[PDB]
Structure 1
Amino acid sequence: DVYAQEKQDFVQHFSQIVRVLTEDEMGHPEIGDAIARLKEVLEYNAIGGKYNRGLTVVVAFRELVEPRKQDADSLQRAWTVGWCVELLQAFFLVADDIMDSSLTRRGQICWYQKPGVGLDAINDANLLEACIYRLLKLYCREQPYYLNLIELFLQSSYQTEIGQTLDLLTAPQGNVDLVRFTEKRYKSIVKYKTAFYSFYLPIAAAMYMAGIDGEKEHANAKKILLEMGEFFQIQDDYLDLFGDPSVTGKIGTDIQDNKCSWLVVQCLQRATPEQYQILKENYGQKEAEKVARVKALYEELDLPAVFLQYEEDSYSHIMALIEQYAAPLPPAVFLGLARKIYK
Structure 2
Amino acid sequence: DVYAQEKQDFVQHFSQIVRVLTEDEMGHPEIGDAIARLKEVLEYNAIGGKYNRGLTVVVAFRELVEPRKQDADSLQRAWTVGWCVELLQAFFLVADDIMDSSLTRRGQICWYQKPGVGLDAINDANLLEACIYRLLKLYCREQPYYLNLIELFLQSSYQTEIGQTLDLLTAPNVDLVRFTEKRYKSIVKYKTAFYSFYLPIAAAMYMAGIDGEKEHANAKKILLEMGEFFQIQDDYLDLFGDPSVTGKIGTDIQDNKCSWLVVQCLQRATPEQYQILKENYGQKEAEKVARVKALYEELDLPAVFLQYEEDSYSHIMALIEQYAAPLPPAVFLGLARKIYK
Per the normalisation by structure 2, the TM-score is 0.96
Alpha-carbon contact 1:105-1:249 (below 8 Å) kept: no
Deviation per CA, 1:58-86, whole angstroms, max 9, x where unpaired?
00001111111000001000000000000
2:148 is the alignment partner of 1:148: yes
Structure 1 window deviating more from structure 2 (306-315 vs 241-250): it is 241-250
Deviation per CA, 1:227-254, whole angstroms, max 9, x where unpaired?
0001111112122323344444444332
Closer, same or farther: CA 247–33 of 1 in aligned 2, 3 Å:
farther
Shift of 1:271: 1.4
Shift of 1:259: 1.7
Alpha-carbon contact 1:104-1:251 (below 8 Å) kept: no
Shift of 1:30: 1.8
Alpha-carbon contact 1:98-1:112 (below 8 Å) kept: yes
Q: Secondary structure at the match of 1:25?
A: helix
Closer, same or farther: CA 109–277 of 1 in aligned 2, 3 Å:
same
Which residue number corresponds to residue 135 of structure 2? Answer: 135
Alpha-carbon contact 1:200-1:225 (below 8 Å) kept: yes
Structure 1 window deviating more from structure 2 (302-311 vs 80-89): it is 302-311
Structure 1 window deviating more from structure 2 (293-302 vs 277-286): it is 293-302
Structure 1 window deviating more from structure 2 (190-199 vs 39-48): it is 39-48
Shift of 1:205: 0.4
Shift of 1:288: 3.5
Q: Secondary structure at the match of 1:179?
A: coil
Closer, same or farther: CA 288–98 of 1 in aligned 2, 3 Å:
farther
2:156 is the alignment partner of 1:180: no
Task: Name the CA distance, whole Å, in 2 between partners of 1:243 and 1:70.
Answer: 40
Closer, same or farther: CA 247–18 of 1 in aligned 2, 3 Å:
farther
Deviation per CA, 1:190-210, whole angstroms, max 9, x where unpaired?
110111000000000011011
Task: Name the CA distance, whole Å, in 2 between partners of 1:313 and 1:201.
Answer: 25
Alpha-carbon contact 1:105-1:250 (below 8 Å) kept: no
Task: Name the CA distance, whole Å, in 1 between partners of 2:293 and 2:213.
Answer: 44
Task: Name the CA distance, whole Å, in 2 between partners of 1:314 and 1:148.
Answer: 31
Task: Name the CA distance, whole Å, in 1 between partners of 2:33 and 2:240.
Answer: 42
Structure 1 window deviating more from structure 2 (318-327 vs 113-122): it is 113-122
Task: Name the CA distance, whole Å, in 1 between partners of 2:125 and 2:249.
Answer: 21
Alpha-carbon contact 1:263-1:303 (below 8 Å) kept: yes
Shift of 1:132: 0.4
Shift of 1:303: 2.1
Deviation per CA, 1:43-67, whole angstroms, max 9, x where unpaired?
1111111111101100000111111
Task: Name the CA distance, whole Å, in 2 between partners of 1:299 and 1:253.
Answer: 17
Deviation per CA, 1:106-163, whole angstroms, max 9, x where unpaired?
1212212222222221111111111100000100011111000000000010000001
Structure 1 window deviating more from structure 2 (32-41 vs 200-209): it is 32-41
Q: Secondary structure at the match of 2:209?
A: coil
Shift of 1:100: 2.0
Alpha-carbon contact 1:108-1:249 (below 8 Å) kept: no
Q: CA RMSD in A?
A: 1.5
Closer, same or farther: CA 299–36 of 1 in aligned 2, 3 Å:
farther
Task: Name the CA distance, whole Å, in 1 between partners of 2:242 and 2:42.
Answer: 27
If asked which structure has higher relative contact order (CA below 8 Å, sep 6+), I would say 1
Which residue number corresponds to residue 195 of structure 1? Answer: 193
Closer, same or farther: CA 188–91 of 1 in aligned 2, 3 Å:
same
Task: Name the CA distance, whole Å, in 1 between partners of 2:155 and 2:51.
Answer: 21
Closer, same or farther: CA 44–252 of 1 in aligned 2, 3 Å:
farther
Structure 1 window deviating more from structure 2 (279-288 vs 1-10): it is 279-288
2:170 is the alignment partner of 1:170: yes
Alignment of 1:18-33 (within 5 A): 18-33=18-33
Task: Name the CA distance, whole Å, in 2 between partners of 1:246 and 1:328.
Answer: 40
Closer, same or farther: CA 240–117 of 1 in aligned 2, 3 Å:
farther
Structure 1 window deviating more from structure 2 (248-257 vs 6-15): it is 248-257
Closer, same or farther: CA 300–113 of 1 in aligned 2, 3 Å:
farther
Q: Secondary structure at the match of 2:177?
A: helix
Q: Secondary structure at the match of 1:192?
A: helix
Task: Name the CA distance, whole Å, in 2 between partners of 1:113 and 1:74.
Answer: 39
Structure 1 window deviating more from structure 2 (141-150 vs 236-245): it is 236-245
Alpha-carbon contact 1:107-1:246 (below 8 Å) kept: no
Q: Structure 1 stretches of 5 or more lacking a match?
A: none
Structure 1 window deviating more from structure 2 (301-310 vs 58-67): it is 301-310
Which residue number corresponds to residue 160 of structure 1? Answer: 160
Closer, same or farther: CA 105–246 of 1 in aligned 2, 3 Å:
farther
Alpha-carbon contact 1:163-1:192 (below 8 Å) kept: yes
Structure 1 window deviating more from structure 2 (68-77 vs 238-247): it is 238-247
Q: Structure 2 stretches of 5 or more lacking a match?
A: none
Task: Name the CA distance, whole Å, in 1 between partners of 2:311 and 2:24.
Answer: 49
Shift of 1:187: 0.8
Per the normalisation by structure 1, the TM-score is 0.95
Q: Secondary structure at the match of 1:254?
A: coil
Closer, same or farther: CA 250–3 of 1 in aligned 2, 3 Å:
same
Task: Name the CA distance, whole Å, in 1 between partners of 2:121 and 2:240.
Answer: 29
